[PDB]
Amino acid sequence: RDADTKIWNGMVGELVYGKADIAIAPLTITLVREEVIDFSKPFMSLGIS
């Protein structure tokens, strides 16, 4: 999110604003992304290393 204009960018913006249908991509499952688009059960696990 842009902090003031309150529009999404990126691939999450492409899904919210109807441009695309599915984001088969390394998109991290976060809280603030979950509220505006649904996420699958995660297909790959990772962490800080």
Binding site: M11, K19, A23, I24, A25, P26
Partner: peptide, 10 residues
């Protein structure tokens, strides 16, 4: 067809 968005990262 279905639009699959993704990004160019190896």
């Amino acid at each position: 067809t279905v639009v699959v968005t993704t990004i160019l990262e190896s």
